[PDB]
Amino acid sequence: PGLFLTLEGLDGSGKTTQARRLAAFLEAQGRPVLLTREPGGGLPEVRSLLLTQELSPEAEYLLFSADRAEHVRKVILPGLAAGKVVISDRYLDSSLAYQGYGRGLPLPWLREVAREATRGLKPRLTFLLDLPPEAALLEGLGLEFFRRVREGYLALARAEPGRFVVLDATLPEEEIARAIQAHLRPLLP
Template sequence: MKGLFLTLEGPEGAGKSTQARLLAEWYEGRGREVVLTREPGGTALGLELRQLLLTQPMQPETEFLLYTADRAEHAAKVIRPALARGAVVISDRWLDSSLAYQGYGRGLRLDWLRAVSAGVVGDLRPDLTFLLTVPPRLGLWRARHRRSSDEPDRLEAEALAFHQRVLQGFLALARQEPERFVLVDAEKPVAEAVQRRIQKVLLERGLV
């Protein structure tokens, strides 16, 4: 059976992790092997990089390169082997997040981000990307209220204007690749309704 690579993208508080988990359960119920993963943090090294990325101040270029190092490990040790054996890989974030956050959000050149990334992930590309959209102000409220700590992570602590640029970046990326991106309105807090929309698209496209 052919492997399938699905990603969930979106701003803070869009519910990506919840939807990724529900989607993994759905595929497992249909008899598929599922690898549920995330960026950063999909490998042992990635977990250490995640702690640095979410807590330590750094230059935008450094931030992108650390995300790219995580992605290199993630692709080589998790995603490619799973796809090779026919599994469904569901990743909470992938390269599009770097383009949206470090490119549109931080102002780094997109052509540089893409060139560096191409040297790391090659032709590895999601079969389908679900872009969960939510107004940044609402998304940040959700993200900060679901945390056990009162301290937001470094990205959540960014100004609202930064998160607005990130969302606009995601939408721009979706316009550039309409065949890969599926926009999903995640503003309403009913996770099951969002999941039904995702499953409907997958069934219609025969990606089961």
């Protein structure tokens, strides 16, 4: 059965911090956990490709999608099948926010690509660490871009209000962790 959880937010919003704290927290409860990440959980060498100068946004998304396809097939679905809690530090929503709202690619196309790439796999909960855009720190990742991405993430959360849990990324680390834990307690068990 398993449980699929993701962390999302701008660069520097505390995703990795919270994903790792959550993994350790759940491991301490005796739960089998698999901690993974994008980009690179599927095809580690995609990280080299993604640094290529002057990439079209289309090519950028297609690279993230290639990694995502491998990631879902070889890592996430097998983890879930073994009954693990699988936590991914970034997932599809990162592409929707960055390549969609940030770069301007059409969301329906992103979703059509993803439908095969992800085999339709959706997280049960997505913890969005909402960070002011000026605090964030690929090419052209400036303030205008980060404002679009930040608001994009908030739009995705309003559209799927049961899946997304929106948290103020500027709260103390331990307060955010307790909030994440509270949202999880009824799901585990």
